[PDB]
RNA sequence: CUUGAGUCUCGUAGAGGGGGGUAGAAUUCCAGGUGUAGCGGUGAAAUGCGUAGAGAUCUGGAGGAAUACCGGUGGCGAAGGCGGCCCCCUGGACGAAGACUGACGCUCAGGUGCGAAAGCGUGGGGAGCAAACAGGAUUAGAUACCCUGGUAGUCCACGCCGUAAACGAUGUCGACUUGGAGGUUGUGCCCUUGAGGCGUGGCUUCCGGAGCUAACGCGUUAAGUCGACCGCCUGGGGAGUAC
């Protein structure tokens with residue numbers, strides 16, 4: 001199992017849908033025997049440059065140990081869900097559980 | 105590349121001892137397994153010439169080793185190539 | 193001066209926008225290693241981090257109005 | 259090279275900051291270089307020449323110019 | 329695969345077959361067949377209304393499902409088949425409730441594959457969903473023009489359409505001709521490109537092949553006598569005329585679209 | 601007829617020519633002037649002085665609108681790039697912000713070939 | 718037998734290769750707003766574009782190609798070559814301690830593979846650039862240089878071609894022979910007291926001793942002292958041409 005690190009930015013008008021979404025993604029990972037090493041809702045945040053003409057995207061961070069098939073499925077879900085503006089699944093070597101600088 | 109556990113299993117199978125890694129038979133077996141594994145990759149990626157260079161090197165090493173076995177000990181050579189199902 | 197020397201930084205983090213802002217100029221461009229004094233390995237790591245942040249709109253690509 | 263003129267900043271002073279900012283950014287140099295396509299070989303050759311000249315000049319100054327000129 | 333036939337005769341030397349071994353070597357599903365007698369390009373007055381049509385092979389008509397209305401019930405692709413009535417290949421599918429149906433085969437599609445029409449249907453090749461549901465940018469085929477009418481656009485081999493935009497009730501389609509066209513977003517559209525893409529790589533190799541496909545020989549207007557064609561015929565090979573159809577209307581470059589009812593839907597006319 | 605008080609001066613300063621364009625803060629152009637129209641051709645319109653008189657002309661043109669504050673956006677490598685802003689200030693606007701917006705690609709389209717002179 | 722050669726364990730750095738996504742800047746085009754006589758170009762002009770509203774400026778859209786800064790006589794690769802970010806597949810190099818095999822090695826005529834750019838075939842794509850081509854200049858002429866345009870091509874898939882000043886103008890492998898200053902990447906000890914002290918490997922740049930060289934220069938990455946094998950040369954032209 002490969003340690004990943006997903007960060008996805010959500011449309012701020014759909015910020016209320018975010019708790020359910022987090023639950024769904026985590027649930028899928030667990031269902032597929034995926035561990036969840038850190039989970040940080042960073043919330044609404046000011047973009048450094050306007051994406052799709054809209055500012056203030058809602059950032060969610062998720063460091064996960066999962067299989068790659070499930071990572072692929074998650075990526076596909078991200079791409080087709082017209083809610084997540086950006087995503088960034090990024091491989092990591094170890095269990096990076098400590099809290100991130102943005103929460104710090 | 106070949107995973108650690110798989111490599112260990114190969115070593116145990118053909119290795120006189122589980123700390124034996126240099127034995128000719130073990131070396132040949134490891135090369136063969138690697139080559140077999142890489143077949144799928146090269147079927148997918150026919151233009152991966154650099155990687156195929158690596159594969160070719162593996163093949164050459166196996167041939168050289170096999171030849172060494174043939175001259176040294178014929179029975180071992182015959183048994184090994186029957187076990188592995190390698191032509192000549 | 194090479195900030196990471198006191199740590200011997202274990203790994204540069206693209207989310208650490210606080211420090212990456214030391215390694216980007218006013219216009220958003222990456223500062224040369226010769227000017228900031230970063231070690232070469234670390235400089236490469238930082239550049240990668242900056243690029244990732246830019247992708248995630250944590251840092252800006254350029255100093256323009258928005 | 260964005261500049262905003264501060265309260266009670268003279269215009270000439272503002273201009274000076276703007277010019278300095280532009281020079282630091284290196285906008286004019288970038289544009290001039292990107293005016294025409296330099297071939298990759300040309301770019302490599304120029305880089306090599308620059309490196310050689312710089313090194314040679316530095317060596318000459320520091321080590322060769324440690325003697326009595328008069 | 330494409331296969332160059334060896335030159336054992338001057339009839340085979342230029343032939344290029346497109347051979348697909350995945351097709352069904354067998355008889356088609358008899359409930360979906362029906363009679364399809366030939367016209368010879370003649371209308372109900374018995375007159376030749378389209379030249380150069382005649383003869384060829386007998387052909388049963390497969391009843392292909394362009395409407396794609398079994399919403400929700402998931403089907404599975406049993407087998408790919410040869411359809412003589414179209415460039416594309418068809419696919420015999422089996423709906424969970426027991427109904428079988430022919431559909432156009434999309435790209436990559438094969439036996440045992442699972443497909444589903446509907447709104448909830450997953451975005452994957454061979455699935456069919458209203459074009460408001462399909463992501464903008466997606467390549468689609470068998471596209472409907474009037475909601476519920478049945479796919480009309482991009483039915484031919486390797487064809488497809490780009491959903492370039494969705495503004496309200498209309499999606500903008502970049503059609504295979506290059507044409508941009510507004511279509512209602514309620515119009516159905518099957519994901520992916522239509523299969524047998526190598527169809528165009530085939531080379532008939534002889535006159536007989538065309539004949540087998542029912543295409544009778546074309547006679548050049550300039551071969552004819554002045555009474556027969558506006559290109560008449562002179563002593564030797566003269567021409568001196570501006571090119572024209574047999575019925576005397578300039579050919580090559582003169583536009584003929586006469587349709588003010590539908591111009592509102594044409595966002596940009598094709599180019600090149 | 602309208603008044604705006606605060607404009608943007610877009611100084612397009614190519615090697616051959618200087619275009620000055622005063623606009624409302626939104627983007628809509630009020631008046632423009634060039635060294636070419638200012639009465640300079642060739643060697644004379646590719647100079648700082650020409651740019652300055654172009655700037656003066658532009659200021660005069662937009663005098664109707666009664667523009668008081670002005671932010672200047674300089675573009676391109678040019679002989680003016682300074683003369684125009686100096687002239688504008690002299691003509692008597694408060695220069696609030698000065699920004700460079702020269703469009704550098706991030707290694708994009710291929711430039712035209714090198715001149716052999 | 719274990720010193721050459723290889724295997725296993727753990728790490729390390731890397732534009733190494735193949736496939737698939739994606740980001741921002743910029744050019745072009747398209748539609749619209751503002752707006753008015755110029756723009757463009759050059760040594761100076763003209764062709765060209767613009768009162769049928771261009772250039773400038775703001776908004777939106779399309780599409781292709783390439784990845785600013787970082788960036789380095791930096792790195793990787795047998796060479797050709799490789800440069801945004803992300804994932805999937807994948808080859809090699811290097812260090813640490815051990816353990817294992819036990820000369821399994823070096824080189825290689827034929828042979829086989831890889832091999833920039835241009836070029837070719839078939840099917841796509843086509844923004845920018847640009848052989849050919851067109852017009853404008855310059856000129857004695859100007860089938861050029863300069864200017865405005867501009868098609869193959871440059872891009873993608875899969876085949877072919879099989880060559881370059883494909884150069885370090887320096888065949889591969891191994892051993893030995895004074896130094897200095899760097900770069901890069903490991904690793905051992907020293908309290909890292911700080912970025913730091915003393916070692917020990919790999920690759921790499923410059924300078925220089927002996928020696929070598931016709932000289933220029935090379936100089937522990939040799940063009941020095943040697944061993945193995947290969948490739949190649951024997952005056953200029955004719956000619957890397959004819960058959």
Ligand SMILES: [Mg+2]
Nearest residue numbers: 379380381546
């Ligand atoms: Mg006909």
Ligand SMILES: [Mg+2]
Nearest residue numbers: 545546547548
């Ligand atoms: Mg014909």
Ligand SMILES: [Mg+2]
Nearest residue numbers: 545546547548
């Ligand atoms: Mg005919």
Ligand SMILES: [Mg+2]
Nearest residue numbers: 551552553561
């Ligand atoms: Mg006749």
Ligand SMILES: [Mg+2]
Nearest residue numbers: 554555557558
């Ligand atoms: Mg007639």
Ligand SMILES: [Mg+2]
Nearest residue numbers: 560561562566
């Ligand atoms: Mg005739």
Ligand SMILES: [Mg+2]
Nearest residue numbers: 561562564565
């Ligand atoms: Mg005749």
Ligand SMILES: [Mg+2]
Nearest residue numbers: 563564565566
């Ligand atoms: Mg005649």
Ligand SMILES: [Mg+2]
Nearest residue numbers: 565566567568
């Ligand atoms: Mg005639």
Ligand SMILES: [Mg+2]
Nearest residue numbers: 293712713715
């Ligand atoms: Mg030019």
Ligand SMILES: [Mg+2]
Nearest residue numbers: 731732733793
């Ligand atoms: Mg790498």
Ligand SMILES: [Mg+2]
Nearest residue numbers: 793794810920
């Ligand atoms: Mg290496």
Ligand SMILES: [Mg+2]
Nearest residue numbers: 825826827828
């Ligand atoms: Mg040979």
Ligand SMILES: [Mg+2]
Nearest residue numbers: 834835836871
């Ligand atoms: Mg090429």
Ligand SMILES: [Mg+2]
Nearest residue numbers: 836837838870
């Ligand atoms: Mg071609």
Ligand SMILES: [Mg+2]
Nearest residue numbers: 839840841842
């Ligand atoms: Mg072509």
